[PDB]
Design a binder for this molecule. Structure first.
Ligand SMILES: Nc1ncnc2c1ncn2[C@@H]1O[C@H](COP(=O)(O)OP(=O)(O)OC[C@H]2O[C@H](O)[C@H](O)[C@@H]2O)[C@@H](O)[C@H]1O
Ligand SMILES: Nc1ccc(S(=O)(=O)N2CCN(Cc3ccc(-c4ccccc4F)s3)CC2)cc1S(N)(=O)=O
Ligand SMILES: [Cl-]
Ligand SMILES: [Cl-]
Ligand SMILES: [Zn+2]
Length: 282
């Protein structure tokens, strides 16, 4: 916990030039069109444009620790708004173009964006979510649960139980939730397209799940400013700001990015909406 390996921190950013970027986002559009089963994998990089610093980027929580500096928040977790990328992923699921979303983010923002919980794996837990130790019932709070490390928050269960409520934030030693990880693994293995968004993929087993798509001929796309662990294994790497890549993709796919209504919780995916007809590819 003092000595916990924090991986490689503050590696240089790569920026694809605009023509190369435009050409790579079109090829990402082509792979989404061809894919039966698209799984998205998200890391702290999708929440940097909403004021929340990442871990290993130039101004990351671990990077600044290594240099004896403090990370800088431009928001509270509570006042944080989902990004363009968060709202793009909401819409891609609604029109049936995303099968499953796996996130390492504890920032609560996929849930607040209105993303269906039944298509989300929160591998490292959720700051707004507490769980009953007895009935395993989860509560999505409008404020951050004040503890970390699967501790007692001080509230009791209201299930028609008085079970002790605990946070969902894994400590370094704590293994991933069996339900979320099993569902993340399954969706990853069965995917023909895995797209990683603002993750450096350095955490096991979180960062290895996109590799499971590569078995039986699936395609891997990494979108990230820095190198990631699995750059070698990727069919397509896109070095740009994830908001720019996702707005450009959504425009190629015929899809508008929807308004955020403010914080809302959807437990179960609604029936799919109409989507644009597919272009002729080959
Ligand atoms: N706007 C942006 N657009 C694209 N990429 C970005 C952007 N901003 C940052 N990045 C990139 O996004 C990447 C973010 O990678 P990391 O910072 O390792 O976060 P994780 O989600 O992988 O951390 C996993 C766990 O490790 C921790 O201990 C916690 O337990 C976490 O849950 C960087 O390479 C940035 O270059
Ligand atoms: N970007 C960022 C920066 C800070 C926070 S946080 O202040 O809410 N807080 C959260 C817990 N960590 C400590 C950890 C303890 C155990 C860890 C761990 C669990 C499993 C597998 C590997 C692991 F390393 S990490 C400190 C920051 C949140 C984010 S966000 N947008 O949610 O990703
Ligand atoms: Cl904090
Ligand atoms: Cl819908
Ligand atoms: Zn209970």
């Amino acid at each position: 916990p003092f000595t916990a390996d924090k991986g490689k921190c503050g590696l240089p950013e790569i920026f694809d030039p605009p023509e190369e970027l435009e050409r790579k986002v079109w090829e990402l559009a082509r792979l989404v069109w061809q894919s039966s089963s698209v799984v998205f994998h998200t890391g702290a990089g999708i929440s940097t444009a909403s004021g929340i610093p990442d871990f290993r980027g130039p101004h990351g929580v671990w990077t600044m620790e290594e240099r004896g500096l403090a990370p800088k928040f431009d928001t509270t977790f509570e006042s944080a708004r989902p990004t363009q990328t968060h709202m793009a992923l909401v819409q891609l699921e609604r029109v049936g173009l995303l099968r499953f979303l796996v996130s390492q983010n504890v920032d609560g923002l996929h849930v607040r964006s209105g993303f269906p919980r039944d298509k989300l794996a929160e591998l490292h837990g959720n700051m707004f979510v507490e769980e009953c130790a007895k009935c395993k019932t989860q509560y999505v709070r409008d404020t951050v649960v004040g503890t970390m490390g699967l501790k007692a928050t001080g509230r009791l269960c209201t299930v028609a139980c008085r079970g002790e409520l605990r946070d969902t934030i894994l400590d370094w030693e704590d293994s991933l939730p069996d339900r979320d990880l099993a569902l993340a693994d399954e969706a990853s293995r069965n995917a023909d397209l895995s797209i990683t968004l603002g993750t450096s993929l350095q955490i096991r087993p979180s960062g290895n799940l996109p590799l499971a798509t590569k078995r039986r001929g699936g395609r891997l796309v990494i979108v990230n400013l820095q190198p990631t662990k699995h750059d070698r294994h990727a069919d397509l790497r896109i070095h740009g700001y994830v908001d720019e890549v996702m707005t450009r993709l959504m425009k190629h796919l015929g899809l508008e990015i929807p308004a955020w209504d403010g914080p809302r919780v959807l437990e179960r995916a609604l029936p799919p909406l109409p989507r644009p007809p597919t272009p002729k590819l080959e």
